[PDB]
Amino acid sequence: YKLVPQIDTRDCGPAVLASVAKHYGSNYSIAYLRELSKTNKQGTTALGIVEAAKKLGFETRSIKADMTLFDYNDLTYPFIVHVIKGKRLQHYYVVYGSQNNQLIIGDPDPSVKVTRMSKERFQSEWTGLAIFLAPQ
């Protein structure tokens, strides 16, 4: 699971983006994506992630789902989620898949990176917003 850790506090949005591109081929510098995604001091908005994704030639959709979303096997990984971690309100993960009760996620937090996560935990952080991407 090819994931790009962040470094500046604000980078999480650019980072999940780039993590996604790598997977589906492309490479892209985070400072660039900062400027594309209109990431500012307080991270990126959900919107910013989208516009950007579109401009890298991605077919983007976003939805409000609930946990049941993960009961459906055609779910095309990877994709992005908006989550809340403690005081980080504009955080995001990459979702790679799910062997077991558990999700394979990538937290651009360089101290976490890719990791398994329980669904209780995930539910409790996840905003319901998912952003699905595929190349055009």
Added chain:
Amino acid sequence: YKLVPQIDTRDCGPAVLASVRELSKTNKQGTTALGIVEAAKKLGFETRSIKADMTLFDYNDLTYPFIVHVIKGKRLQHYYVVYGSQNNQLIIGDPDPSVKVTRMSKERFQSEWTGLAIFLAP
């Protein structure tokens, strides 16, 4: 229920801040929840933000009014004002000038809400 409707598709954050003009690190995409907070702190507010679920509305302490981050269709950084939980239905304010204040079912609200609530007091 004092609510200030918005004008541009971006003002929704400033608009909910209207809580009893033009500001606060609000860029071309509405705002971040972060921005709403900082701002609220300016204006002299004590700000508590938390991830909740619907059980939150089971709380008799619940200090209305307060703010929520919700998704409306493809408006991903939208927000409402929550005025009260008078029964199985909520009193909300949608800065969307075509909606403004309105009752809302909890199934509907659950379906739009991101879980994020931001509580303010002077």
